[PDB]
């Protein structure tokens, strides 16, 4: 409210008369004549902390963390567990970096680009998305958001020759250019591992755009793909190694309960 409840001339009654010391409106005549005026307590009152439009809405994240968090969101789209444990159904699909050739971008009628998704068996996920066409739980249904929708795969490309048309009608799908990616659409809900369909002209650029550890990237100036704090990361292959089990004390497996 810009100025709510203060658009009223009122005052405390002051003296006795067995009333509380809240400000009362003036006058006579009508109903609203001696009632409790402004204050968070009263009906028709200015709320406590009338909110200001200069709340710090927008937040900063420095660029290297935005690039650390998107290296970490594409590699989870490669592991066959994390992209199933998020909810995408890659059960009957081939190799997890799905890369189709550049001929996909010459699709210009969506009868064609659906039986692309059927022949790759990626239609086992869109068949799930039609099931999730529910309605919103709460009071969002009057703020013109009414239909919840489980996000589907994302086709990531470059050099559009019509593929933005023949995929923008399929529900739950997302199309994002491999030049200009987006962390918000590669991890819906902050849960890593969205399933992605690539393209040859898209999938090859990432060696020259995020770089490797051997060199840097050529389409970003001062970036190198970040370091990996664990070289050998499976400790079950480590803790069952002869360097360690030469060094250990012994296990100690009696229970030694409470003796009466």
């Amino acid at each position: 409210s810009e100025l709510a409840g203060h658009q009223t001339s009122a005052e405390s009654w002051g003296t006795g008369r067995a009333v509380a010391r809240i400000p009362r409106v003036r006058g006579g005549g009508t109903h609203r004549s001696g009632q409790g005026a402004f204050g968070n307590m009263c009906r028709g009152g200015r709320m406590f902390a009338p909110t200001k439009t200069w709340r710090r809405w927008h937040r900063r994240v420095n660029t290297t963390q935005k690039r650390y968090a998107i290296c970490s969101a594409l590699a989870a789209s490669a592991l066959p567990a994390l992209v199933m444990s998020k909810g995408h159904r890659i059960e009957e699909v081939p190799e997890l970096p799905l890369v189709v050739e550049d001929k996909v971008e010459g699709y210009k009628k969506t009868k064609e680009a659906v039986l692309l998704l059927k022949k790759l068996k990626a239609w086992n996920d869109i068949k799930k998305v039609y099931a999730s066409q529910r309605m919103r739980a709460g009071k969002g249904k009057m703020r013109n958001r009414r239909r919840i929708q489980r996000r589907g795969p994302c086709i990531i490309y470059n050099e559009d020759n019509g593929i933005i048309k023949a995929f923008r009608n399929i529900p739950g799908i997302t199309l994002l250019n491999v030049s200009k990616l987006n962390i918000l659409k590669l991890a819906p809900g902050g849960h890593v591992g969205r399933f992605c369909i690539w393209t040859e002209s898209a999938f090859r650029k990432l060696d020259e755009l995020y770089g490797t550890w051997r060199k840097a990237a050529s389409l970003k100036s001062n970036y190198n793909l970040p370091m990996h704090k664990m070289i050998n990361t499976d400790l079950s292959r480590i803790l069952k190694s002869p360097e360690i089990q030469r060094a250990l004390r012994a296990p100690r497996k009696k229970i030694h309960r409470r003796v009466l």
């Binding site: 009057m142 013109n144 923008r168 009608n169």
Partner: peptide, 13 residues
């Protein structure tokens, strides 16, 4: 999907 900005999408309108 609607792309024309000068036409509505809201239930209450």
């Amino acid at each position: 999907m609607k792309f024309n900005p000068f036409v509505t999408s809201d239930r209450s309108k």
